[PDB]
Design a protein around this ligand. Structure first.
Ligand SMILES: C=C(c1ccccc1)[C@@]12CC[C@H](NC(C)=O)[C@@H]1CC(CCCCCC)=C2c1ccccc1
Lengths: 235, 11
């Protein structure tokens, strides 16, 4: 028993193993071409850059989104690209995560104490707030159906202005919201709080991602980061 | 943002 709409969003999900194998392959070749004479932060920028390519390809092929004109498509992705990265990170730790470890889009597992040594104070703070979201979502039994809904609520955001077809963005927001409310009610009838607890995470994810952008823009002006990641920071 | 428009249009 699943609303037809949530099924339509599920069929648009990419094959996770193939997205991850591709990113892993790209990063292997890049390191092969480098002479011994790339910081860990630089590597993560490369990894997130490749993740943005697959996010664009996903959205491009997704229901509703593929009906928007290119200009409207660009405005939506420029407003939520960072939220989608952080949301995919969070869901990655929910499914595969382990305390003291961070699972990357490449399928690799890394120790928290290794990363926390290098990330710096600001990223450690943002990573910590994300982990607190992980633990919260894990105790709620965050599943894939609820995940794809939140992905579309992030993508089709009401904060996006100057759209030619704002009616569609508003319609998707409304119908995905109604389906999630129905899905949690039917499949978790004993969790009155689940719906609200899920939606209350979107503002938190927004804050983490907007602060992550501001930090990455700072790191770029510092000369610490030209690819898709840069283009999205400036736009 | 030329790169983003290209990724949305390319065949
Ligand atoms: C937004 C990110 C990022 C981080 C560093 C540089 C560029 C982009 C992600 C978003 C998810 C991506 N996942 C990857 C590369 O596997 C990124 C990696 C990640 C986990 C921690 C690694 C830091 C070592 C220097 C990020 C992140 C998660 C929560 C809060 C803030 C940042």
């Amino acid at each position: 028993s699943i609303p037809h709409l949530i099924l339509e969003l599920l069929k648009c999900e990419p094959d996770e193993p193939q997205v991850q194998a591709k990113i892993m392959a790209y990063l292997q070749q890049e390191q092969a071409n480098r002479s011994k004479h790339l910081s860990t932060f630089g590597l993560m920028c490369k990894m997130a850059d490749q993740t943005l390519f697959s996010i664009v390809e996903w959205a491009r092929s997704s229901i509703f989104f593929r009906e928007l004109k290119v200009d409207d498509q660009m405005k939506l992705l420029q407003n939520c690209w960072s939220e989608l990265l952080i949301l995919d990170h969070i869901y990655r730790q929910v499914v595969h995560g382990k305390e003291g470890s961070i699972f990357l889009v490449t399928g690799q597992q890394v120790d928290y104490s290794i990363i926390a040594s290098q990330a710096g104070a600001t990223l450690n703070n943002l990573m910590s707030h994300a982990q607190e979201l992980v633990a919260k979502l894990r105790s709620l039994q965050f599943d894939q159906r609820e995940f794809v809904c939140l992905k579309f609520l992030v993508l089709f955001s009401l904060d996006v202005k100057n759209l030619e077809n704002f009616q569609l963005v508003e319609g998707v927001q409304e119908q995905v919201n109604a389906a999630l409310l129905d899905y949690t009610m039917c499949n978790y009838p004993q969790q009155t709080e689940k719906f609200g607890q899920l939606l209350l995470r979107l503002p938190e994810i927004r804050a983490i991602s907007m602060q992550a952008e501001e930090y990455l823009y700072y790191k770029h002006l510092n000369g610490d980061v030209n690819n898709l990641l840069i283009e999205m920071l400036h736009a | 943002n030329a790169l983003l428009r290209y990724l949305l249009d390319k065949d």
